[PDB]
DNA sequence: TCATATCACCTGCGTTTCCGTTAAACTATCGGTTGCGGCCATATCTACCAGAAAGCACCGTTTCCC
């Protein structure tokens, strides 16, 4: 009922009311992905990117099946210097589907920045 | 012949989460091997010392001199 009312308010562009209703559920469960599927949109549009990335990452630990999205979670985590989290997100991208080859390259930049090259080398051989 | 509810089950499939595996860069000692220097032995040089034959000075019995 709360999730329907919050998503209805989101469709009405009543984003603060939508947030207040999603917060009634998030207060009971901080990992409630069913709220973040649209509350994350509110947080991204309002520039709350620090809270937005965490809303994706902590809930997606459980809700990992939207696998293409882990690339976006990894990218934003790296832009915010949450580098462990960025590598952990790219791991799920590659573990769920290796064919997202640009993700191997992007992850290899994190490896280049910190000297973690032994993980990049076999990956670049596969890319080549 | 498909579409719900409820209970015994038990046995079965193959699922679903934190731990285990192969092997990473970076980590904490600690070992095979590198170079560097004490105690003690020797022949020589020396400091500190006493003893003898000989110096040498303090002394007063002598007697010549005030």
CB A42 within 8 A of CB A19: yes
* The nucleotide closest to A118 (CA, C1' atoms): B24
CB A17 within 8 A of CB A27: no
CB A36 within 8 A of CB A59: yes
Residue A109 tokens read as: 């930049």
CA–CA separation, A88 and A96 (whole Å) = 12
Structure obtained using: cryo-EM
CB A84 within 8 A of CB A53: no
Rounded distance in angstroms from the CA atom of residue A25 to the C1' atom of nucleotide B8: 38
Compute the Cα dihedral for A104, A84, A110, A53 and give only its sign: positive
Written as one string, the DSSP assignment of A26-81 is HTT-TT-HHHHHHHHHHHHHTT-HHHHHHHHHHHHTT-TTSGGGHHHHHHHHHHTT
Number of C-beta neighbours around residue A21 at 10 A: 23
CB A53 within 8 A of CB A73: yes
| Placement of tokens 């985590």 in the chain | A77
**Residue A116: CB less than 7 A from any atom in strand B:** yes
Stated in angstroms to one decimal place, the resolution of this structure is: 3.8
**Residue A118: CB less than 7 A from any atom in strand B:** yes
| Placement of tokens 């769920």 in the chain | A96
């Amino acid at each position: 009922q709360l999730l329907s009312q919050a998503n209805e308010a989101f469709v009405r562009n009543d984003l603060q009311v939508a947030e207040r209703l999603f917060n009634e559920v998030i207060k009971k469960d901080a990992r409630n992905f069913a709220a973040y599927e649209t509350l994350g949109d509110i947080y991204q549009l309002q520039g709350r990117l620090n809270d937005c990335c965490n809303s994706w990452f902590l809930a997606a630990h459980l809700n990992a099946s939207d696998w293409e999205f882990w690339k976006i979670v990894a990218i934003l985590s790296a832009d915010l210097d949450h580098v462990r989290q960025a590598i952990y997100c790219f791991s799920r991208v590659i573990s769920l589907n290796p064919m997202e080859w640009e993700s191997i390259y992007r992850r290899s930049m994190l490896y280049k920045k910190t000297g973690q090259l032994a993980r990049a080398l076999d990956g670049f051989q596969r890319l080549y």
